[PDB]
């Protein structure tokens, strides 16, 4: 009965794995931080795949009540999207255990998001207060996420199904969230999933990539563009997302940031804008260190599980 | 004096008629098929003209209070579409009548629209609780609609202006309308008309082939991923919006519905997602016929016009 | 301290200028009709940066009211967008000085938003009603003219950056615009800025265009075609547009018109759409130049100045 926010924790380390996997055909030692990083994400994914396990068995209820929640169903999907990331880790080991992750992970995202989000449809349970950027993470992220990882077993035209509907969900939510944000103060509790607004250009762009080949064309370079701008609004506005103290749901920002450095990765392989690809592979690495070394340090206060 | 959302009915089989007739390269026989619903939807469209007319002629303040009603004014469009259609049809038996209904449905659109969608930005008569499916057929649908008849007649640069303004109408009303029905439970009397949510993405991607010689491209690929997700939400929610009964506004799916039928045809001869396609083209004509069906029902019972 | 919206008109005769001098290679007069515009565009801007200068030393409360206005912010935005314009005019001159003002203005531009655009997210400011047409410029129409400056340098990959920071920008704040548009209707003070309304489809088309080497491909008559209508649409709202009276503020059209202008060239050049080309360049002229009229006019009545 971890909190299931948590899953930002394994599913960042993974994305951040895979980034530099991708750099192994330029610098072959990145293939040793990407086995370091794939085999710890894997690692805190079993054992909080274990704790959710016992929580379905023996806290149902809470698991109940998370799930008819207009506003914290969302977390669930992240586990469906780190046990797709954690198959497309395996597949370098077994790509047969690495397909079963990723089909387990793309049937149970697709039926979650076909049972949940279109419930929401039927109104009268979702409110204005409910817009919030986890909504992404139904609608968007495990899209995105089934499309790469289907394109990585090759199945690229089904991975551009998956890719469409992330990427018009993604248009098609952020246009209410940005007005409510924009009207309604975000209270501190919910602040940190701010972080979760960085990744829908990146997590796109990586995807695209993913599926295409890593051909760095006019569509790659747009979605950056629009990833960078969210980014820097997020920098300018760091200090008030972290108002009330630094805290474990930092990690929200840990998709976007893992998924900036893995996109980097193709641009510069693309020989495009090679100099904001190092900048941007580099900061995002640093950030996602500061977040390792800030959960370490609470894990030694005793302030990490509730 | 027929409800005005009957011409779905004429809309419905047109489209469908369509589908057929481009699978006759593939499947000689599909043109038979094609000719009976195409011949069975133009004899529909020239009585519900005829009605519509009289309706005009003696029932004049009711059109008049359809038409300006911030809601209801939108099936109206509905007319200019299905001429469309009924001139894409008779096309294959003499392009000079087809032309002329084509631009007569174009032109007709472009005023209606142009008349009353932006009358709706003086304010004050739409309310939130306008926000509904319908606002789709004029926006959009009219103008994808324009775009496939217009390349039809060989005007592909034309087609292009009328496809970008019904994607990019389209793009820009679905974020606020997903937002009013989460929020706000759409009531049963207007709950079939979820059926022309299915629309946007099968009208958008079967318009695109049309224009684009039928080249099953990544932004193809991207539309059918978005119109599939949205197929299987309203599967889902297919109970909720029957919730107190079939009635004869189902046929506001038939529109997307036979739109996936003429995308897969164009699939099917890209050879992209051959086995989507085929299950997509049957389930869509299956669902068509159930429509067929249950309206041959209520004739049979004097229950179809009011 | 001049009324900061006036910018609109230097801003407009400069794009203008650019419209102008792209039809050089077709018709060599127009370099003439070119020059003399950004001459008079250059001259008008250094006059209100001046004036604007000593606003910001001798009415600074003034500026820092506006400045935290979360309606009245953007129209600070016009000050970095004319610079560039500016520059872009000068650069056939001296790419040395036109260089300088371009990253003035893009610098300036990027670290506006970057402050303001993104506090707006903290809430509590902003509020429904202060979703004006206005927002436009700081997000939307400053990042494409960054684009397109950038691009005249020879920084293409860096321009589709600032391009896709437009364009997805437009599309996640127009549908909430348009959706409060219907509601509320806009106040006679303010509904010249319905202006700002033509602007993002042309604007976006003409920044694209000049990133990509003039290519008029499908991007671009998408584009076109949803610009059209958005111009369709305020034709028919002209009347209640200027319910109250002709009025400077006016002058927000031009930026769009003078974009329909600038895109109408490159399509001309690409014969594609010929004819609505010159209809175009024509009709932007014909209303700019009323403009000009009306001002001179209103300057003779000593009715310009506050
Ligand atoms: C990982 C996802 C967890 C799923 C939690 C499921 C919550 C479902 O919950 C329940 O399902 C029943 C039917 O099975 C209904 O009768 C209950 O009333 C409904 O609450
Ligand atoms: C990982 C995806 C598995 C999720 C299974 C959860 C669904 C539990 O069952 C379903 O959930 C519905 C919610 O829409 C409930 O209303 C109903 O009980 C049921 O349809
Ligand atoms: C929501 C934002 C979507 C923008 C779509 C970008 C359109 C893609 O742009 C297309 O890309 C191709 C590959 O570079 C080019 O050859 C085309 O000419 C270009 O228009
Ligand atoms: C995704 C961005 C990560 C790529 C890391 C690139 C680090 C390499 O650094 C680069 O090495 C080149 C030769 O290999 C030198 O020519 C360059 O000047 C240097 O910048
Ligand atoms: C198929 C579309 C039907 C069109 C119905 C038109 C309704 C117009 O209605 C009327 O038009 C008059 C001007 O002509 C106004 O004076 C009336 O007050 C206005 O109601
Ligand atoms: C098929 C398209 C024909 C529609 C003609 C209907 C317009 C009737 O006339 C118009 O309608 C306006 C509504 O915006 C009314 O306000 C005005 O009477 C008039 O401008
Ligand atoms: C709102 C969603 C729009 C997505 C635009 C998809 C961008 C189109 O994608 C472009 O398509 C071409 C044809 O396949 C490719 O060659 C380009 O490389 C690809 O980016
Ligand atoms: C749009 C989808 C409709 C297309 C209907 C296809 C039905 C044909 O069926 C197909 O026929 C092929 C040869 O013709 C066989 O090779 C295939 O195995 C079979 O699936
Ligand atoms: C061209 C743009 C004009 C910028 C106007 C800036 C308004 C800033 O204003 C002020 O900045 C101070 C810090 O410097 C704060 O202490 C003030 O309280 C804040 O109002
Ligand atoms: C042309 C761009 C220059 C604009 C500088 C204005 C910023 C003044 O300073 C800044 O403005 C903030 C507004 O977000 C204020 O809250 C703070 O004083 C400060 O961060
Ligand atoms: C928000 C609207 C975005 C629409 C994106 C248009 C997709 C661009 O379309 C792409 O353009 C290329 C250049 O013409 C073509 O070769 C591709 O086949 C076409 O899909
Ligand atoms: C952007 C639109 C502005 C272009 C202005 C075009 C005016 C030229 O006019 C055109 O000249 C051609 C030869 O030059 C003649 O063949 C054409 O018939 C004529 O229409």
């Given at each position: 009965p971890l909190p299931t926010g948590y899953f930002d924790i394994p599913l960042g380390l993974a994305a951040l794995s895979l980034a530099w996997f991708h750099l192994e055909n330029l610098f072959p030692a990145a293939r040793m931080v990407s086995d370091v990083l794939g085999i710890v994400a894997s690692a805190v994914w079993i054992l909080f795949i274990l704790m959710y396990a016992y929580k379905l068995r023996y806290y149902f209820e809470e698991v109940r009540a998370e799930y008819h929640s207009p506003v914290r169903?969302?977390?669930?999907?992240l586990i469906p999207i780190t046990t797709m990331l954690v198959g497309d880790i395996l597949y370098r080991w077994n790509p047969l255990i690495a397909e079963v992750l990723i089909w387990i992970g793309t049937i149970g995202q697709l039926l979650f998001s076909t049972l949940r989000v279109s419930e929401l449809?039927?109104?009268?349970?979702?409110?204005?207060?409910?817009?919030?950027?986890?909504?992404?993470?139904?609608?968007?992220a495990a899209n995105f996420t089934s499309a790469s990882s289907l394109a990585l077993l090759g199945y690229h035209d089904l991975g551009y199904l998956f890719f469409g509907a992330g990427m018009i969900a993604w248009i098609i939510f952020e246009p209410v969230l940005l007005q409510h944000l924009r009207i309604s103060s975000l209270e501190p509790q919910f602040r940190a999933t701010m972080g979760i607004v960085l990744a829908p250009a990146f997590v796109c762009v990586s995807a695209y990539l993913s599926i295409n080949h890593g051909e760095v064309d006019t569509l790659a370079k747009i979605l950056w563009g629009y990833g960078f701008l969210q980014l820097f609004f997020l920098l300018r506005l760091f200090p008030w997302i972290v108002e009330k103290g630094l805290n474990?749901?930092?990690?929200?920002?840990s998709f976007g940031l893992a998924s900036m450095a893995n996109s980097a990765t193709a641009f510069y392989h693309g020989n495009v804008l090679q100099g904001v690809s190092i900048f941007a592979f580099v900061f995002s690495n640093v950030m996602i260190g500061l977040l390792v070394l800030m959960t370490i340090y609470k894990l030694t206060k005793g302030q990490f599980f509730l």
């Open positions: 169903f969302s977390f669930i999907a449809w039927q109104g009268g349970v979702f409110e204005q207060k409910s817009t919030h950027p986890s909504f992404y993470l139904p609608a968007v474990i749901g930092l990690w929200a920002f």
